[PDB]
Design a protein around this ligand. Structure first.
Ligand SMILES: Cc1ccc(C(=O)Nc2ccc(CN3CCN(C)CC3)c(C(F)(F)F)c2)cc1C#Cc1cnc2cccnn12
Length: 292
């Protein structure tokens, strides 16, 4: 309730115009007036995180901790950035950048090629080239390399946790933040993104996020495909113990599949780092056709 004031980040409440809910604590779309010192007269569309009415002191401490972590990490183009907070005289609001094109999974699926008689009415007004897909991978690797340089371990890197802005910029999110059988809102199992050592030994490192990044690359090249569809938790454990790896998606180069497979090295020390992935993806982007 009574939080201390951080003038670096404090935005007066009368400057924030709460709008439609974006997700559910809970996230709402809002308009911030004079978020920056100049101009005090410009409105910026923002996303506001707040607690729900049924929240406890632990939920408040979690929101505070998340806001505190975002302050420490600092700004990067490929992460959802903290813009402000309302901590005084009312509920805590954590104001962050708004990504109008939703999560990367939704973004990719909406840009899938048009429906056919064997699918047949998916008629997108939006389409992605091969260069655009490698660009998404590069931007996510860049956000992750930055987070890694700030000693941050994501633990849930997946296309659902990557947001897309109006300018098509990839931004890593978290929803700064376990039941293996718990499914996402979309009905998918997060264990399908977890490195075996994180899954079986609860060892979380940058190497285990690199494993998750390999699953994220697979999600990109299948245009929002669902990893291991119809595979329950127990069968997934068995696939990992057998050293099973997902097949190469169609419209994926041998080079990019080799990258996915490298991210999925059984030995964590042998996986590429985010620094190596950013360099390889930088070179690959430049050589990838935008003609198809
Ligand atoms: C309201 C809000 C609050 C917070 C965050 C947020 O991303 N917080 C965050 C917390 C922790 C971490 C890092 N940790 C991960 C865990 N790990 C164990 C420790 C390290 C990071 C990270 F980006 F650095 F990864 C971010 C996003 C939103 C949003 C939004 C928004 C904007 N546009 C749209 C459009 C549709 C829907 N939502 N939306």
């Amino acid at each position: 309730y009574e939080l201390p004031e951080d003038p670096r980040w404090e935005l007066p409440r009368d400057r924030l115009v709460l709008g439609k809910p974006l997700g559910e604590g809970q996230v709402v779309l809002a308009e911030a007036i004079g978020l920056d010192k100049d101009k005090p007269n410009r409105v910026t569309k923002v996303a506001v995180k707040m607690l729900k009415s049924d929240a406890t002191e632990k939920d408040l401490s979690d929101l505070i901790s998340e806001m505190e972590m975002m302050k420490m990490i600092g700004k990067h183009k490929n992460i959802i950035n903290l813009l402000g907070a309302c901590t005084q005289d009312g509920p805590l609001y954590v104001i962050v950048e708004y990504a109008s094109k939703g999560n990367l999974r939704e973004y990719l699926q909406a840009r899938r090629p048009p429906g056919l008689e064997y699918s047949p009415s998916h008629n997108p007004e939006e389409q992605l080239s091969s260069k655009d897909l490698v660009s998404c991978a590069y931007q996510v690797a860049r956000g992750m390399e930055y987070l890694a340089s700030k000693k941050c371990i994501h633990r849930d890197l997946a296309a659902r946790n990557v947001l897309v802005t109006e300018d098509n910029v990839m931004k890593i999110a978290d929803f700064g933040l376990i039941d293996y059988y718990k499914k996402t809102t979309n009905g998918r199992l997060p264990v399908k993104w977890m490195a075996p050592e994180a899954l079986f030994d609860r060892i979380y490192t940058h190497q285990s996020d690199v494993w998750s990044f390999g699953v994220l690359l697979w999600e990109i090249f299948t245009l929002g495909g669902s990893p291991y569809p119809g595979v329950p938790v127990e069968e997934l454990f068995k696939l990992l113990k057998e050293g099973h790896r997902m097949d190469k998606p169609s419209n994926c180069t041998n080079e990019l599949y080799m990258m996915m497979r490298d991210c999925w090295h059984a030995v964590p020390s042998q996986r590429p780092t985010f620094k190596q992935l950013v360099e390889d993806l930088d070179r690959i982007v430049a050589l990838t056709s935008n003609q198809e």
